[PDB]
Design a protein around this ligand. Structure first.
Ligand SMILES: CCCCCCCCCCCCCCCCCC(=O)OC[C@H](COP(=O)([O-])OCC(O)COP(=O)([O-])OC[C@@H](COC(=O)CCCCCCCCCCCCCCCCC)OC(=O)CCCCCCCCCCCCCCCCC)OC(=O)CCCCCCCCCCCCCCCCC
Ligand SMILES: CCCCCCCCCCCCCCCCCC(=O)OC[C@H](COP(=O)([O-])OCC[N+](C)(C)C)OC(=O)CCCCCCCCCCCCCCCCC
Ligand SMILES: CCCCCCCCCCCCCCCCCC(=O)OC[C@H](COP(=O)(O)OCCN)OC(=O)CCCCCCCCCCCCCCCCC
Ligand SMILES: CCCCCCCCCCCCCCCCCC(=O)OC[C@H](COP(=O)(O)OCCN)OC(=O)CCCCCCCCCCCCCCCCC
Ligand SMILES: NC(=O)C1=CN([C@@H]2O[C@H](COP(=O)(O)OP(=O)(O)OC[C@H]3O[C@@H](n4cnc5c(N)ncnc54)[C@H](OP(=O)(O)O)[C@@H]3O)[C@@H](O)[C@H]2O)C=CC1
Ligand SMILES: CCCCCCCCCCCC(=O)OC[C@H](COP(=O)(O)OCC[N+](C)(C)C)OC(=O)CCCCCCCCCCC
Ligand code: SF4
Ligand code: SF4
Ligand code: SF4
Ligand SMILES: [Zn+2]
Lengths: 116, 56, 156, 96, 48, 176, 46, 339, 154, 207
């Protein structure tokens, strides 16, 4: 049948959502010494808040194969921050400290330009 | 090529070979920098007959 | 008689020293590094202008960017520039290091090294011929000869 | 044949000149505005018109393969002059 | 040049200049075209 | 056909072994290396005295750009945009419109000498030999902006290098 | 109306070009060098 | 204004914002951030400089090709001022100096030069003008630095009636001369303080907050002909503030008192050097001046900016004063209640 | 793109005539040097099977003894009309692959010598204007040769 | 023979066609299609479930002995349901011949890693994952190889813009190299070069 599709790691959501939790634990117990080695100027508080935001955006997913990739890519993004392959700039590219706000209210977009 | 004979012998003895016949500097064996204009050939398709494109 | 003359001549000496002993740090990244090596070859012999072949970043004075500066490499280039002792100059060599060159529109290429470090000379070409680069280094010396570091101190 | 504007900015052959209050004039302060003195439209209108005795004359820019693609020009119209599309030289028919 | 002099023409420079970079005579780029869109100048005579 | 580069076995007779023993103990082979460098201490160096001497080139060389003119004075460029469509790096921007005398001529011609890869395709495609790569290679600048040529700079280069550009084409226009 | 003229090898071809390894052999036998060295010492000690 | 340069783009590096700005004194600590913001949004910034072209190199990467323009000027040549402001729409003056010189003193840099800029700008046609003053500015203060700003601040508003004036407090930052100053006193042993640092209340303000505030005044039309006062979120006691500096620096702290007159004596032999004075009699006074609490002047919040706490961005500045790289938390400095 | 300018194949002969000695001067410094041998002998040993299964090609196969060179097994152009030899290693280390490269410089002189003698006359680009552009003399006198010039470059 | 037409090689055409049926008969389970192009190349199309059985056959079978992985790459064709097209190019030194083996997958379907068969495929599969997003199962180490660290996307896919989504510079406020949305001084210019006249009647698709 066409609907049947080969899996990646998990055969259903219940098994797939286990890895999200195991991945989350790795990140939560890695920020404090990530902020230490990289000598960042962000507290462990808002560092952990950032990981909360990243997961929360991929919360509407319902496909076990899509979730596996988002975990596989999540594990890679962690191996770079533990083996310090990333430099100080790469870790600070999540926090967007150099892009001016882009307001969402209609008037602000109307005043500035033609975009929606 | 302006090396005195005694220096020629010393450089030749040190290297174990006659370096004067195979200088790595060019003096006069290079071709001239201005040449007569050429007239290059033309390919085998420059025919006025029996040259329909569909056969090549 | 005026102090301006005493400090103008004394500025010429320090300018002369810094222009007759340039010690470059070659950031050879791409093809443009081959022409840099030729400039050090017997025919041109940069070493006879007081310019040594290579040096460590903290013994260096001028940084020669010769190649394409990708995004992955940009963080490293800036770090070496920050650790170079002053005075320091950057020579941007080749079309890739000036404004992107052949790869201007690539997702992975930094469209000009001037977006990462300041630049004092631009040597165009693809690659700039070994002699073209030697025109850039000499043109760099004439910049250092015009500097008035001590004059501006005397009139603050 | 420059036509320097009242504010003192030269006009190029394309006709570009910044207006009195255009902030882009600041790029010239301390420097100069690159302008080409020899205008194309003033060097090709000062050429003599060639008189030829046939209804069709062919121009190839002069110099053989160092000019422009050879074209053929029709001189049947008495009112105006034939004009090469590439080089701008002019031709006229003798009497007919 | 003393033997084979170049061909002479009116538009060729009679005073060759050297690299003018860094001096006031340097070259400053600019757009050589004209304005594309023209705006509407309101009448200077007040209404009413 | 092939050949072995390092297949010969060393000898094992009394004289051969002593030669290898004498070489090791007396540094014979290394003293032979010092000889070669000594020869180069008595050879004329190949260094040319730039800038009073120059490296050889040929008429085909590809350097700074220049828009040419006809013998009369009219521009050769008729704004066909063939060069713009062959430029690998998209370093050329062209705009055109009828002139006051009703001729096809350009009102914008810029070469971004930082995007350009100095490849020569622009002069291979020009049907009237208007855009050429002159023989100059010494135009290093002190600012990024002044490497963005427009029509005025290119036309000055034609009026500046016409003496040498025309000669080079005369020596090369039969091969191309 | 001249013939075709283009770059071609001269009539009769070019002269031979060497390419093989030609490292010369030089020096005295291993025995002899020791004899000079040993003999140099003994005169020194004497 | 029939030209009205029109914004285009997404407010990025290659966009057009329509602000043609002349930033006098842009080669210094406060200039770096103002030029950086103006260029980061694609603005035409003219940078007149008195220094050598080498010292302005760090500014070149801060704008797109052709945006940052450098001109040569002299504070005593009004024609050089006019050449740098005739084509602009906003003029920002950041000229100043912590010490006097044989050629320029506090009267010339804070009154004569600012007065010249305003008079030239008004005739040139500039519609905006941003001036920078000091929060503790008055004409009855022992410090000469703070006396010359009060005089100048008044002359600007009688020469450019629409000018905007800003009165920040001691600004801290990476290149500042406030936090780095205290950390550098470790060379001479103890850390002398008039009295013992008590009775001194200071309200430092972060550089970016000042920089973001200045830009806002260039966009909104409510900032014309109005005075502001950029101050931090909390008020500290000078002793507590200095103690916190050595805590982050993780260095010995041995404060000892020094009479006010005695502190001025040493400040006289430190200003005899023909170079950047290490400390001056004037510097001692400002370090021990209690920042005013003017409540009738709009602050950063009135311009949409939010003040940055000292604690959040203090490890950033002092990181290099520590003598070990990692060092394996420092308690926040005591804050006076706002009341 | 263009034919060789007159007076070029003579200069190549002058360069090729003297190059072989330059290689000999290179080998004097390195081949039999004890210091250079110690930094390349028994270093980077690669087995024949590993070289093939790791995707190695070129002197990385020959250096290990595998007899393979695309110029002789899958010839392209006229590499089937030049005689040359393919140096082959016996040990598969840095020193052997250094001798293959130094030997390959000598076989290149061997090939370059033959190319100078056996160079035939004629044209230098396919005589088909729909693939290779026409000459500028023809593009300026024939309407067919201008259309094909126009469309090959646009 | 014509001087401007590449000569045919009928002898090679027959031999590779003969070897095409040989493989199709020995692996009916995986082989789906077998071509031989007019310039004598052999392409074998297989079900994705047959990467190891068909590669292990060619690498070990006596009459195949394809003991060298020339290259491994993917081709993106968005229109197809399974957009990606994995391609293997093998070489046989014993028989002096080359064979190209093609399979396919989509975004979310794994393809078995071939490192057990060809150690050269280690890095090649990392490149496919980095540039195309295809995930290879049981790969000893699967990480980005070419792209910048933390790069979001897969550039070689046909729907990733040529200029990317972010660009780098050095903002002096924070003293680091930062990333910002992409803005270009001169937009890349799109050319419509395709002629509206059929160029080759031989490759004409059905209506
Ligand atoms: C130690 C021995 C030093 C020997 C002195 C130099 C010398 O005579 O060598 C020339 C000559 C060898 O030179 P060469 O390399 O064969 O000639 C190359 C060209 O023909 C020569 O090329 P050229 O024809 O172009 O000659 C031009 C050159 C010719 O000038 C010279 O010949 C140099 C003479 C310097 C003595 O003119 C100069 O450049 C003059 C520059 C002088 C520089 C000062 C050098 C001496 C420094 C002494 C300390 C400072 C006081 O002497 C020899 O025949 C062998 C000398 C070995 C035996 C020395 C026994 C004592
Ligand atoms: C002065 C150096 C000039 C270069 C001379 C090179 C040369 O002739 O080498 C020939 C030969 C080359 O030797 P070889 O390594 O080629 O082999 C020689 C042995 N047979 C003959 C079997 C091949 O080297 C010598 O003869 C040098 C003798 C040894 C001298 C070293 C003594 C130790 C130093 C004592 C302090 C003085
Ligand atoms: C030297 C002696 C001699 O003349 O050679 C005699 C003999 C013949 O040697 P051959 O036939 O070539 O092959 C080796 C056979 N055993 O050669 C030999 O067989 C001798 C084999 C044994 C040699 C042992 C050497 C011990 C180390 C002492 C080194 C002495 C050399 C150094 C001194 C140089 C001379 C002053
Ligand atoms: C500075 C250099 C380093 C110090 C070396 C000093 C000695 C100089 C070595 C020069 C070697 C030499 O003379 O080479 C040339 C000569 C060639 O002779 P030939 O056999 O005819 O070669 C062509 C044959 N086709 O080759 C020879 O015939 C060799 C003649 C020299 C013999 C030198 C003595 C032998 C070496 C061992 C003794 C070393 C200790 C000597 C005592 C040192 C204190 C002085
Ligand atoms: N930073 C702080 O803590 C405070 C700042 N301010 C005010 O901000 C302004 C200065 O800020 P800041 O950046 O730290 O000062 P800086 O020490 O960093 O330099 C000020 C700039 O003004 C120039 N300058 C000084 N004198 C002259 C002169 N005679 N002629 C021309 N230029 C001159 C300097 O040019 P160059 O160096 O190249 O010679 C320099 O670029 C002052 O008005 C100050 O009162 C307000 C409250 C606190
Ligand atoms: C009094 C304080 C102590 C100084 C001691 C004396 C040495 C200082 C000057 C040497 C450098 C110099 O002179 O610089 C280089 C100059 C050339 O420069 P120019 O192009 O003529 O410069 C013109 C003005 N510019 C710089 C603004 C363009 O070389 C000479 O003419 C060297 C001749 C004097 C040699 C003395 C040797 C002792
Ligand atoms: S500018 Fe040209 S030679 Fe230099 S790195 Fe780029 S492509 Fe290579
Ligand atoms: S040389 Fe090449 S890259 Fe440069 S302008 Fe001409 S066609 Fe474009
Ligand atoms: S330079 Fe030549 S090819 Fe380019 S537009 Fe002008 S005429 Fe056409
Ligand atoms: Zn014509």
């Amino acid at each position: 049948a066409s609907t049947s599709v080969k899996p990646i790691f998990s055969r259903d959501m219940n098994e797939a959502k286990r890895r999200v939790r195991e991945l989350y634990r790795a990140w939560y117990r890695e920020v404090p010494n990530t902020v230490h080695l990289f000598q960042l100027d962000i507290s462990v508080k808002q560092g952990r808040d950032k990981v909360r935001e990243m997961f929360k955006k991929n919360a509407h997913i319902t496909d076990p194969r899509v979730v596996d990739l988002l975990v596989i890519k999540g594990k890679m993004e962690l191996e770079e921050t533990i083996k310090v392959w990333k430099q100080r700039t790469h870790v600070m590219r999540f926090f967007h400290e150099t892009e001016a706000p882009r307001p969402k209210d209609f008037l602000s977009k109307f005043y500035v330009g033609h975009d929606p | 090529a302006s090396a005195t004979r005694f220096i020629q012998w010393l450089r030749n003895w040190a290297s174990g070979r006659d370096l004067q016949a195979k200088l790595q500097l060019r003096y006069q064996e290079i071709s001239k920098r201005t040449q007569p204009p050429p007239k290059l050939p033309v390919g085998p398709s420059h025919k006025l007959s029996n040259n329909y494109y569909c056969t090549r | 008689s005026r102090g301006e003359y005493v400090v103008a001549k004394l500025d010429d000496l320090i300018n002369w020293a810094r222009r007759s002993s340039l010690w470059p740090m070659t950031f050879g990244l791409a093809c443009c590094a081959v022409e840099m090596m030729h400039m050090a070859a017997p025919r041109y012999d940069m070493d006879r202008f007081g310019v040594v072949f290579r040096a460590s970043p903290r013994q260096s004075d001028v940084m020669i960017v010769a190649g394409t500066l990708t995004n992955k490499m940009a963080p490293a280039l800036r770090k070496v520039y920050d650790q170079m002792p002053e005075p320091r100059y950057v020579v941007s060599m080749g079309s890739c290091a000036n404004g992107g060159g052949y790869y201007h529109y690539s997702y992975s290429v930094v469209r000009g090294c001037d977006r990462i470090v300041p630049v004092d000379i631009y040597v165009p070409g693809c690659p700039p011929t070994a002699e073209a680069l030697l025109y850039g280094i000499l043109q760099l010396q004439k910049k250092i000869k015009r500097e008035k570091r001590l004059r501006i101190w005397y009139r603050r | 044949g420059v036509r320097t504007s009242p504010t003192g900015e030269k006009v190029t052959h394309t006709g570009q000149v910044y207006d009195d209050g255009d902030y882009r004039k600041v790029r010239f302060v301390g420097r100069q505005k690159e302008v080409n003195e020899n205008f194309a439209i003033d060097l090709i209108a000062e050429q003599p018109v060639s008189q030829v005795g046939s209804r069709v004359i062919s121009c190839d820019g002069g110099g053989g393969a160092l000019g422009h693609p050879r074209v053929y020009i029709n001189l049947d119209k008495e009112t105006k002059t034939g004009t090469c599309g590439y080089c701008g030289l002019q031709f006229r028919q003798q009497h007919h | 040049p003393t033997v084979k002099p170049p061909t002479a023409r009116k538009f060729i420079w009679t005073n060759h200049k050297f690299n003018l970079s860094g001096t006031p005579q340097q070259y400053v780029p600019y757009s050589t075209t004209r304005k594309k869109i023209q705006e509407w100048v309101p009448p200077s005579t007040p209404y009413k | 056909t092939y050949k072995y580069v390092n297949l010969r076995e060393p000898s094992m007779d009394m004289k051969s072994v002593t030669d290898r023993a004498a070489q090791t103990l007396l540094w014979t082979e290394l003293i032979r290396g010092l000889g070669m460098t000594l020869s180069y201490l008595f050879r004329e160096p190949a260094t040319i005295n730039y800038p009073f001497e120059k490296g050889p080139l040929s008429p085909r060389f590809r350097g700074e750009h220049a828009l040419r003119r006809y013998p009369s004075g009219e521009e050769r460029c008729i704004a066909c945009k063939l060069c713009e469509a062959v430029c690998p790096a998209q370093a050329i921007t062209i705009e055109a419109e009828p002139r006051a005398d009703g001729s096809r001529r350009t009102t914008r011609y810029d070469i971004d000498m930082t995007k350009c890869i100095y490849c020569g395709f622009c002069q291979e495609a020009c049907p009237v030999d208007a855009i050429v790569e002159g023989p100059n290679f010494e135009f290093s600048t002190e600012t990024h902006e002044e490497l963005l040529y427009n029509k005025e700079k290119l036309l000055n280069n034609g009026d500046k290098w016409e003496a040498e550009i025309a000669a080079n084409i005369q020596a090369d226009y039969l091969y191309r | 109306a001249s013939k075709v003229k283009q770059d071609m090898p001269p009539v009769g071809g070019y002269g031979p070009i060497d390419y093989k390894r030609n490292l010369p052999r030089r020096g005295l036998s291993g025995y002899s060098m020791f004899a000079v060295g040993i003999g140099a010492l003994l005169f020194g000690y004497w | 204004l029939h030209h009205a340069v029109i914004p285009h783009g997404k407010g990025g590096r290659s966009s057009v914002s329509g602000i043609v700005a002349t930033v006098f004194g842009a080669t210094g600590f406060l200039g770096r951030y103002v030029v950086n913001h103006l260029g980061r949004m694609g603005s035409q910034v003219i940078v007149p400089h008195r220094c050598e072209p080498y010292d302005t190199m760090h500014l070149r990467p801060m704008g797109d090709l052709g945006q940052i323009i450098f001109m040569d000027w002299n504070g005593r040549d009004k024609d050089s001022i006019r050449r740098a402001v005739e084509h602009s729409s906003v003029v920002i003056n950041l000229v100043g100096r912590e010490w006097e010189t044989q050629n320029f003193d506090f009267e010339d840099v804070f009154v004569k030069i600012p007065q010249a800029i305003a008079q030239v700008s008004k005739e040139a046609g500039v519609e905006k003008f941003i001036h920078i003053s000091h929060l503790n500015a008055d004409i009855k203060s022992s410090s000469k630095y703070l006396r010359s700003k009060a005089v100048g601040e008044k002359e600007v508003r009688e020469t450019f009636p629409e000018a905007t004036i800003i009165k920040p407090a001691e600004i801290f930052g990476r290149e500042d001369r406030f936090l780095n100053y205290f950390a550098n006193i470790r060379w001479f042993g103890g850390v002398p303080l008039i009295s013992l640092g008590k009775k001194t209340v200071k309200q430092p303000v972060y550089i970016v907050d000042v920089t973001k505030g200045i830009i806002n005044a260039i966009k909104d039309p409510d900032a014309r002909g109005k005075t502001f006062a950029f101050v931090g979120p909390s008020r500290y006691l000078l002793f507590d503030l200095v103690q916190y500096v050595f805590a982050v620096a993780h260095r010995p702290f041995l404060p000892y008192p020094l009479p006010h007159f005695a502190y001025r004596w040493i400040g006289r032999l430190f200003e005899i050097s023909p170079f950047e004075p290490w400390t001056t009699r004037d510097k001692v006074e400002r370090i021990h001046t209690t920042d005013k609490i003017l409540p009738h002047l709009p602050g950063l919040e009135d311009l949409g900016v939010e003040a940055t706490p000292l604690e959040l961005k203090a490890i950033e500045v002092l990181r290099r004063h520590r003598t070990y790289r990692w060092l394996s938390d420092v308690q926040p400095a005591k804050t006076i209640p706002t009341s | 793109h263009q034919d060789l300018p007159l007076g070029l194949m003579d200069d190549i002969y002058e360069f090729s005539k003297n190059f072989s000695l330059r290689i000999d001067e290179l080998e004097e410094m390195l081949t039999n040097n004890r210091i250079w041998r110690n930094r390349t002998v028994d270093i980077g040993i690669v087995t024949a099977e590993d070289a093939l299964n790791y995707g190695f090609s070129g002197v990385m196969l020959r250096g290990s003894g595998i007899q393979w060179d695309l110029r002789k097994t899958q010839p392209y152009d006229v590499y089937d009309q030049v005689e040359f030899d393919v140096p082959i290693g016996s040990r598969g280390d840095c020193y052997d692959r250094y001798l293959c490269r130094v030997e390959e410089m000598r076989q290149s002189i061997r090939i370059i010598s033959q190319c100078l003698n056996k160079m035939p006359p004629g044209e230098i680009k396919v005589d088909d204007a729909k693939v290779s552009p026409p000459k500028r003399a023809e593009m300026k006198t024939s309407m067919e040769s201008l259309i094909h010039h126009f469309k090959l470059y646009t | 023979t014509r001087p401007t037409v590449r000569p045919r090689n009928d002898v090679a055409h027959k031999q590779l066609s003969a070897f095409g049926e040989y493989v199709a008969e020995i692996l009916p389970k995986y082989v789906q299609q077998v071509q031989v192009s007019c310039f004598n190349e052999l392409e074998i199309c297989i079900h994705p479930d047959g990467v190891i059985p068909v590669l292990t056959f060619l690498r070990d079978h006596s009459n195949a002995q394809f003991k060298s992985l020339a290259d491994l790459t993917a081709v993106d064709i968005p229109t197809r349901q399974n957009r990606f097209e994995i391609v293997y190019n093998l070489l046989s030194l014993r028989f002096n011949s080359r064979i190209r083996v093609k399979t396919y997958t989509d975004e979310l379907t794994p393809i078995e890693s071939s490192v057990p068969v060809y150690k050269a495929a280690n890095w090649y599969e990392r490149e496919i994952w980095d540039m195309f997003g295809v995930f290879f199962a049981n790969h000893p180490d699967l990480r980005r190889i070419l792209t910048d660290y933390g790069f979001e996307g897969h550039p070689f896919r046909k729907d990733f813009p040529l200029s990317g989504y972010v660009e780098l510079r050095y903002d002096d406020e924070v003293k680091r190299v930062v990333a910002e949305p992409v803005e270009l001084a001169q937009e890349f210019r799109k050319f419509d070069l395709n002629s509206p006249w059929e160029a080759f009647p031989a490759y004409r698709q059905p209506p």
